[PDB]
Design a binder for this molecule. Sequence first.
Ligand SMILES: CS(=O)(=O)Nc1ccc(CN)cc1
Ligand SMILES: CS(=O)(=O)Nc1ccc(CN)cc1
Length: 291
Amino acid sequence: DPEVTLLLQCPGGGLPQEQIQAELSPAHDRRPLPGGDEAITAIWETRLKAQPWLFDAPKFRLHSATLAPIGSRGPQLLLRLGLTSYRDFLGTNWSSSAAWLRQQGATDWGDTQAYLADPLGVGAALATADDFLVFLRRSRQVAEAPGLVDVPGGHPEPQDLAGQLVVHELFSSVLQEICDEVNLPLLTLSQPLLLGIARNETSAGRASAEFYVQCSLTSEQVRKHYLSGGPEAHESTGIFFVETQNVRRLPETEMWAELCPSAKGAIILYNRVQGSPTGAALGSPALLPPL
Ligand SMILES: CS(=O)(=O)Nc1ccc(CN)cc1
Ligand SMILES: CS(=O)(=O)Nc1ccc(CN)cc1
């Protein structure tokens, strides 16, 4: 699918928190725009003068992610991170001129992303005790991917020797987003495993970390918890479930056309890293039917 590119596929069925290092450095920040950051300031002033209740927030910026040689001991992943903001996102990735900033970045820095905010998103493939994944319908009133299907997630907000605290906030934030939006108790959720990193080509290449989380509740109990919050307890307008059996072929369904690019990323990485068995037993024709 051309609206999603894989930056990273994790080994071993996905990486726990203890196997990831982060390097948070101003060397990983966005570069100042060619004619100056005054362009970002002008877009922000126009937006506030229309919507004065808006506020800025800091974000992590993804620079790059390097996997160790497979089968090695020690830390398996290095995440290179900078800092950005909602304001910088609205003035770059979301700008009408975002494709021009990518061309300029290639020319000036040999890096299509050099002049982009590129805030790091998080998302979950969330599995129930009865083997379904959880999907959410987006409001038709929001600016981004209105009315489309999504998975749980949300752009983490800042605050290996501050590195480990940054990895902790990324893993924490995926569980926190599931509690806030799906209304599940924290104690029903497994520690997340990182499946990979996917890039949204419809948002100038901004990246999301995609995780696997297991819930001890059935689909029926997850639905009850979500609905029991009422319309004000959640940003989404509805919840639904697809058997993990059927997720394998999702790209061939009519649902695929309704999935926002970052949820497409979560499903592709789930299928490659948690699905696609490698051993004789799970690989046998009766358990892995052809076609
Ligand atoms: C309103 S929202 O969709 O919950 N937005 C959001 C989601 C996740 C994080 C992570 N810190 C921050 C903000
Ligand atoms: C392809 S299928 O006929 O929809 N059935 C299927 C799908 C996935 C698995 C792996 N658990 C097993 C069976």
